Structure formats: C-alpha cells, structure tokens
Design a protein around this ligand. Structure first.
Ligand SMILES: COc1nc(C(=O)NCC(=O)O)c(O)c2ccc(Oc3ccc(Oc4ccccc4)cc3)cc12
Lengths: 225, 11
C-alpha cells in the first residue's frame, strides 16, 4: 500500500493548513440551533462562506500561478461543492442538523425552504454517509483541492496544467488514505463516489437560473450562481 | 463581470 512521499507530506501540510485557516470555528460551541423571505435570510449568510472558499484557493500556490480568468471559472465551479462538503462533515446525528457558516445549525426542512430544494436531501444524505468515513481536516482539504482543480470546466485556458495539479492532489490523497487505514472497505473507490456526489450538487447550479428579482440577492451569490 | 471576484482574487 503506497504511502505519502516527502513531497506529498508538504502538499498535505499546504492544503490542510489553507483549509483550517479558512474553515469557520472544535469551536459546536458557537452553534445556533435556529418563499423569498427565507431565501433572502439564507443568501445573506452565504457571502462569508464564498469568501472563505476564495481564501482557501488563494492560500494554495498552484492556484495563484493560474491566470485570474482561470481562477474565476475554477471558483464559480467549486464554491457550492466545497460549502456543501464543509456543511455535510458538520452533521450531528443527535440534532439531525448541518452547521452552516461559523455555527448556524440548519434542518433538512429549513434548508429546503431556503431554496436548495432536492439539494438539501442530497447534502443531508452525504453528511449522514460521511459520519462513518471519519474524514480529518487533511482529507476534507484534499477533496476541496480535487474539486477546485477541475479541467472539465468550460472556458479554461490551462486545461493541461490543472489536470496535472489534480493528479498530484489525487495521488497524495490516496497515499494518505493508505497511511490512515480507515476501518471502512473500498475507502478510496468510495471517496471517488462522494466526489461525484459533491460534483452533482454543483451541476444543479441552474436549480438558481430558473429560481432567479436579481437585486434581492447578495452580489457574490450572483457572481458564482 | 466577476468584478467583486477579481477584486477578491487580485487582493
Ligand atoms: C451548503 O450551502 C451553504 N453553505 C453555507 C456554509 O456556510 N457552509 C458550511 C461551511 O462552509 O462551513 C452557507 O452559509 C450557506 C448560506 C446560504 C445558502 O443558500 C443557498 C440557497 C440556494 C442555493 O441554490 C443553489 C445553487 C446552486 C446549487 C444548488 C442550490 C444556494 C445557496 C447556502 C449555504
């Protein structure tokens, strides 16, 4: 079972540290436990979440080496994916909630009523499946990097460089999963499915385009859709 | 326009 090379430990350090630096509050301790009149009150709290994703991506050298036109396509592509992952890994089986932003504990119904629709059940089912995965800050950060560095995104210029970065993250990630020896079977094939699970959530980005009026939505929410 | 996104990205 191949384990991380020294160069992968450095990439792992870089990606884990950029994640924890840009992840809102151990500090469950700050949790809340709380129609366009609920969409409005939700979209209001997305603007800090979008910024954190940009901040994570900026704290990743390989991304800072891409032209800003590629940086923008890549960020519009992975924001919802990363926010959804960051919320699903903060699933409490007891309260049956996800924790949004710093700590606003939302329910499947509340998030459905916030305009996510079927994407609520999607992230809730993801969170429930991710409990037995026991993903540490390193594993969450490397998922975010695999999602972020996607060349299948329309309008990209450096498709070849981006696929390289992703193959790096993907291999460093598998080697860490090898080192980590989770008690779940087919763990690596099972994560590639949760990447698909995550990617499908961010492919429903028109399910906004249909549920558009526009000035009733935060500007950063409109820039990534 | 991604004007605020450029702003955020280009410091
Ligand atoms: C998981 O999504 C969110 N996460 C967080 C957060 O902090 N995550 C945890 C963390 O990152 O630590 C938020 O704060 C959100 C605030 C508003 C929000 O409203 C939304 C309402 C409708 C909507 O339509 C779709 C657009 C595209 C695809 C699917 C649906 C998107 C968004 C969603 C949030």
């Amino acid at each position: 079972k191949p384990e991380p090379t020294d160069e992968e430990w450095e990439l792992i350090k870089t990606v884990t540290e950029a994640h924890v630096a840009t992840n809102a509050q151990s500090h469950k301790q700050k949790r809340k436990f709380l129609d366009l009149e609920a969409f409005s009150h939700f979209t209001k709290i997305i603007t800090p979440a979008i910024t954190r994703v940009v901040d994570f991506a900026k704290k990743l050298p390989m991304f800072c080496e891409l032209p800003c036109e590629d940086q923008i396509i890549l960020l519009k592509g992975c924001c919802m994916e990363i926010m959804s992952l960051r919320a699903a890994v903060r699933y409490d089986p007891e309260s049956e909630t996800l924790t949004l932003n710093g700590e606003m504990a939302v329910t499947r119904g509340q998030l459905k009523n916030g305009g996510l629709g079927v994407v609520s059940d999607a992230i809730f089912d993801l969170g429930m499946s991710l409990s037995s995965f026991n993903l540490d800050d390193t594993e969450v950060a490397l998922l975010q990097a695999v999602l972020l560095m996607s060349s299948d995104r329309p309008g990209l210029a450096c498709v070849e460089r981006i696929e390289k970065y992703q193959d790096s993250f993907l291999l460093a990630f598998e080697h860490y999963i090898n080192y980590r020896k989770h008690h779940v079977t087919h763990f690596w094939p099972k994560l590639l499915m949760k990447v698909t699970d995550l990617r499908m959530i961010g492919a429903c980005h028109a399910s906004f385009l249909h549920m558009k009026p526009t000035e009733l939505f935060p500007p950063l929410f409109l820039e990534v859709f | 326009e991604n004007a605020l996104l450029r702003y955020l990205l280009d410091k």
